[PDB]
Symmetry: C3
Subunit: 200 residues, 3 copies
């Protein structure tokens, strides 16, 4: 009904995500359709590993101050193995859980091919043929422990990845310059939208 | 018709809200059902009292430099007395207005208990199933006068309040570090979403 | 069916917008009806002229550091002549393309008159007598190249313009202080919502 309009991890998932090692994080992502767009809410709590309690005082160095989460999808919109997120509880909504069986098609939840092409190349491109790099991209912040003093630079990129010969993709890139001393990666929630691929 | 999907005060309200004194502010809040999520828009013009002409030069203190707006719901999603907003014109959409008679049940507009649960704040071990307080929070900025130079740090908290045996809450926290000389607290409009509760 | 819910510039549009010269930019604007709000997504690529390759080091004046795009509408919600945007492939969705006929009436997709009204005389007397300019405004940054290091102050504004006896107006205002050196104007995507005009 309204539930085929939503695809999510669950509102309160079990560990379902690899940031650093297997199942070290809980990603709550809900994708909903309002017509031609997807309306999305995301959140990330990391419960163990390299980012469960950041200390950039005792661990400075690029690799302790950034990471990314990738949703990779095949032609029908099925999650592919190379993904950060586990498929077990990624499915269509049902009264606060997921449908019994794993889904066959979710093309209408995928970021548009046309608005978000895989590669743009404006080296030798005439101006009227030029495409937008930036357009595939939402740049905002989230906040550790929902504290304004603790921003984390968030980039959401559509159809950026090539991993696993995927045809669609949602990437969440996270980075910070503050040197956070003993702060869990526990994010505020973030609203975002993108243009949906057309079914059939 | 499609106004059953909207619960919204009014597009243009009479002073309907308490920041510092009774009916001292005009809160515009619309909540629309986009399936499993609520898409909200919010503005706050304070019309009289302590925040109606901010002067941190003359009043340098903490209590002049922040305030908070609490909406308190019961089990049926009806608005409780403790709330900053008054329920006279808080109701479903009829054309450009509300339905005459106050609503029985708005539970499906409330923030999801599962996504955003009650957390009794005690020293808690084992982060691998501690429920996240950050998740319940959207952190962003509104701009006073719609001017980029005049930011206000804005925290939107779901299911945070303990007051009046509320089951559900939506709390707007406005704070600013900058020292403003005669600026009316007059916010830019802010878009946000959250995961909705389900019903019968 | 559901396509009559989307008023859009194509997802992958031809040069369609005047920032500086006729047809110097590709504006992507998607409007979808979600109940009583419009859920919008907006992005701007400039391909020629004065902002096709910003260099505030060679061009340091204000006129090279800011520009605005005006959508102007009439009482049917159809585009007018003064509009930045060429109203020739600006139509209701049909599949991944656009409908045969030009779009007739689209009043349901306009910013709400009551919510965002035209400015008059303001006074401290409060029988009802306050107007918030800010309420009419969403203020945020977008990011050139989708780079965190390259913010641009963005203001969206509803029913503000007076040009060509317009009833309804959407205006995107861009402004930066940073001195960009050989940066195409190519904005990261922006999600936003506003209250719709009530259809009849």
């Amino acid at each position: 009904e309204n539930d085929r309009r939503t695809l999510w991890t669950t509102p309160d998932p079990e560990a379902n995500c690899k940031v650093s090692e297997e199942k070290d994080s809980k990603l709550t992502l809900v994708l909903t359709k309002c017509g031609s767009q997807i309306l999305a809410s995301v959140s990330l709590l990391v419960v163990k590993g390299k980012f469960a309690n950041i200390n950039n005082k005792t661990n400075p160095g690029e690799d302790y101050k950034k990471f990314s989460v990738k949703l990779l999808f095949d032609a029908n919109g099925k999650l592919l193995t190379g993904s950060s997120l586990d498929g077990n509880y990624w499915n269509y909504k049902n009264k606060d859980s997921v449908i019994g069986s794993p889904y066959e098609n979710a093309v209408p939840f995928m970021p548009n091919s046309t608005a978000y092409p895989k590669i743009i190349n404006n080296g030798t491109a005439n101006p009227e043929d030029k495409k937008s790099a930036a357009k595939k991209t939402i740049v905002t912040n989230v906040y550790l422990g929902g504290d304004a003093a603790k921003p984390v630079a968030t980039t959401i990129s559509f159809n950026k990845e090539t991993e696993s010969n995927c045809v669609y993709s949602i990437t969440f890139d996270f980075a910070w310059n503050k040197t956070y001393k003993n702060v869990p990666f526990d994010s505020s929630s973030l609203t975002f939208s993108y243009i949906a691929q057309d079914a059939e």
